[PDB]
Design a protein around this ligand. Structure first.
Ligand SMILES: [Cl-]
Ligand SMILES: [Cl-]
Ligand SMILES: [K+]
Length: 164
Protein backbone atom coordinates (compact mmCIF):
# COMPACT_ATOMS: atom_id res chain seq x y z
CA UNK A 1 0.00 0.00 0.00
CA UNK A 2 1.10 3.68 -0.78
CA UNK A 3 -0.52 7.08 -1.54
CA UNK A 4 -1.11 6.17 -5.19
CA UNK A 5 -2.78 2.83 -4.42
CA UNK A 6 -4.75 4.43 -1.59
CA UNK A 7 -6.14 7.24 -3.70
CA UNK A 8 -6.77 4.88 -6.61
CA UNK A 9 -9.11 2.91 -4.35
CA UNK A 10 -10.77 6.05 -3.00
CA UNK A 11 -11.26 7.84 -6.29
CA UNK A 12 -11.71 4.97 -8.80
CA UNK A 13 -10.76 5.27 -12.52
CA UNK A 14 -13.11 6.60 -15.18
CA UNK A 15 -11.96 7.56 -18.63
CA UNK A 16 -14.90 9.75 -19.64
CA UNK A 17 -15.94 12.97 -17.92
CA UNK A 18 -18.29 12.19 -15.01
CA UNK A 19 -19.61 14.04 -11.95
CA UNK A 20 -17.92 13.54 -8.62
CA UNK A 21 -19.62 13.21 -5.21
CA UNK A 22 -20.21 16.92 -5.12
CA UNK A 23 -21.72 16.95 -8.61
CA UNK A 24 -18.55 18.44 -10.22
CA UNK A 25 -17.16 17.39 -13.58
CA UNK A 26 -14.10 15.19 -13.12
CA UNK A 27 -12.16 12.55 -15.06
CA UNK A 28 -9.55 9.85 -14.54
CA UNK A 29 -8.54 9.18 -10.95
CA UNK A 30 -10.37 11.96 -9.20
CA UNK A 31 -9.04 14.76 -11.39
CA UNK A 32 -11.45 17.64 -10.74
CA UNK A 33 -11.95 19.65 -13.88
CA UNK A 34 -14.10 22.54 -12.72
CA UNK A 35 -16.83 23.49 -10.39
CA UNK A 36 -18.71 25.04 -13.28
CA UNK A 37 -22.04 23.47 -14.30
CA UNK A 38 -21.01 23.94 -17.91
CA UNK A 39 -19.95 20.69 -19.58
CA UNK A 40 -18.32 22.76 -22.22
CA UNK A 41 -16.27 24.50 -19.63
CA UNK A 42 -15.22 21.12 -18.22
CA UNK A 43 -14.25 19.88 -21.63
CA UNK A 44 -12.10 22.94 -22.24
CA UNK A 45 -10.30 22.35 -18.91
CA UNK A 46 -9.72 18.74 -19.95
CA UNK A 47 -8.16 19.62 -23.26
CA UNK A 48 -5.88 22.21 -21.58
CA UNK A 49 -4.84 19.67 -19.01
CA UNK A 50 -4.09 16.89 -21.50
CA UNK A 51 -2.74 19.09 -24.26
CA UNK A 52 -5.04 17.90 -27.11
CA UNK A 53 -8.63 18.29 -28.32
CA UNK A 54 -10.22 15.35 -26.61
CA UNK A 55 -13.88 15.21 -26.93
CA UNK A 56 -14.22 14.19 -23.15
CA UNK A 57 -12.49 10.77 -23.18
CA UNK A 58 -8.90 10.07 -22.29
CA UNK A 59 -6.65 7.00 -22.15
CA UNK A 60 -5.56 5.18 -18.99
CA UNK A 61 -2.01 6.39 -19.47
CA UNK A 62 -3.30 9.96 -19.71
CA UNK A 63 -5.41 9.47 -16.56
CA UNK A 64 -2.35 8.22 -14.70
CA UNK A 65 -0.32 11.19 -15.93
CA UNK A 66 -2.76 13.66 -14.43
CA UNK A 67 -3.00 11.56 -11.24
CA UNK A 68 0.77 11.70 -10.71
CA UNK A 69 0.67 15.46 -11.26
CA UNK A 70 -2.19 15.76 -8.85
CA UNK A 71 -0.53 13.75 -6.08
CA UNK A 72 2.67 15.72 -6.55
CA UNK A 73 0.71 18.97 -6.40
CA UNK A 74 -0.99 17.92 -3.17
CA UNK A 75 2.34 17.22 -1.51
CA UNK A 76 3.59 20.53 -2.88
CA UNK A 77 0.62 22.31 -1.45
CA UNK A 78 1.17 20.89 2.02
CA UNK A 79 4.88 21.77 2.01
CA UNK A 80 4.07 25.40 1.13
CA UNK A 81 1.31 25.83 3.64
CA UNK A 82 2.28 27.15 7.05
CA UNK A 83 -0.49 25.32 8.78
CA UNK A 84 0.01 22.00 7.14
CA UNK A 85 3.72 21.63 6.82
CA UNK A 86 4.54 21.21 10.50
CA UNK A 87 1.83 18.58 10.91
CA UNK A 88 3.02 16.74 7.86
CA UNK A 89 6.61 16.84 9.03
CA UNK A 90 5.61 15.49 12.41
CA UNK A 91 3.95 12.36 10.99
CA UNK A 92 5.19 8.89 10.02
CA UNK A 93 4.90 7.98 6.30
CA UNK A 94 1.57 6.16 6.59
CA UNK A 95 -0.13 9.05 8.33
CA UNK A 96 1.49 11.48 5.90
CA UNK A 97 -0.30 9.66 3.08
CA UNK A 98 -3.63 10.14 4.98
CA UNK A 99 -3.03 13.88 5.04
CA UNK A 100 -2.14 13.94 1.31
CA UNK A 101 -5.40 12.07 0.68
CA UNK A 102 -7.42 14.73 2.45
CA UNK A 103 -5.67 17.55 0.54
CA UNK A 104 -6.24 15.78 -2.78
CA UNK A 105 -9.95 15.57 -1.98
CA UNK A 106 -10.56 18.97 -0.41
CA UNK A 107 -7.63 21.21 -1.28
CA UNK A 108 -4.95 22.82 0.84
CA UNK A 109 -7.19 25.53 2.10
CA UNK A 110 -9.89 23.10 3.11
CA UNK A 111 -7.60 20.89 5.15
CA UNK A 112 -5.64 23.82 6.64
CA UNK A 113 -8.90 24.86 8.22
CA UNK A 114 -9.15 21.71 10.36
CA UNK A 115 -7.14 23.55 13.02
CA UNK A 116 -8.13 21.56 16.08
CA UNK A 117 -7.80 18.18 14.34
CA UNK A 118 -4.42 19.21 13.03
CA UNK A 119 -3.26 20.10 16.53
CA UNK A 120 -4.40 16.74 17.91
CA UNK A 121 -2.51 15.01 15.11
CA UNK A 122 0.60 17.01 15.89
CA UNK A 123 0.22 16.01 19.56
CA UNK A 124 -0.12 12.36 18.52
CA UNK A 125 -3.49 12.05 20.32
CA UNK A 126 -4.75 9.55 17.76
CA UNK A 127 -8.07 8.56 19.12
CA UNK A 128 -9.02 12.08 20.01
CA UNK A 129 -7.98 13.35 16.57
CA UNK A 130 -10.07 10.62 14.94
CA UNK A 131 -13.17 11.66 16.93
CA UNK A 132 -12.57 15.29 16.07
CA UNK A 133 -12.00 14.65 12.38
CA UNK A 134 -15.41 12.96 12.15
CA UNK A 135 -17.20 16.09 13.29
CA UNK A 136 -17.13 17.60 9.81
CA UNK A 137 -18.99 18.13 6.62
CA UNK A 138 -16.29 15.95 5.06
CA UNK A 139 -17.15 12.95 7.17
CA UNK A 140 -20.92 13.42 6.81
CA UNK A 141 -20.81 13.75 3.01
CA UNK A 142 -18.31 10.90 2.36
CA UNK A 143 -18.42 8.77 5.47
CA UNK A 144 -16.98 5.50 4.13
CA UNK A 145 -13.99 7.22 2.58
CA UNK A 146 -13.55 9.48 5.59
CA UNK A 147 -13.67 6.51 7.85
CA UNK A 148 -10.85 4.89 5.91
CA UNK A 149 -8.68 7.96 6.10
CA UNK A 150 -9.49 8.47 9.77
CA UNK A 151 -8.59 4.84 10.66
CA UNK A 152 -5.28 5.41 8.87
CA UNK A 153 -4.60 8.45 11.10
CA UNK A 154 -5.79 6.57 14.14
CA UNK A 155 -3.64 3.51 13.67
CA UNK A 156 -0.74 4.42 11.44
CA UNK A 157 -1.49 1.17 9.50
CA UNK A 158 -3.10 0.42 6.09
CA UNK A 159 -5.75 -1.86 7.63
CA UNK A 160 -8.66 0.16 6.24
CA UNK A 161 -7.40 -0.41 2.70
CA UNK A 162 -6.36 -3.99 3.07
CA UNK A 163 -8.75 -6.38 1.39
CA UNK A 164 -10.21 -3.82 -1.02
CL1 LIG B 1 -4.00 20.03 -14.63
CL1 LIG C 1 -17.69 7.68 1.09
K1 LIG D 1 -14.11 9.95 -7.76
Amino acid sequence: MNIFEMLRIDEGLRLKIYKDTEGYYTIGIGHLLTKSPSLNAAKSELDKAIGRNTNGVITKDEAEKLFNQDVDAAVRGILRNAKLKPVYDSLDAVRRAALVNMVFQMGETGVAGFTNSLRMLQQKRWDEAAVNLAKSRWYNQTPNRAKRVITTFRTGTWDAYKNL
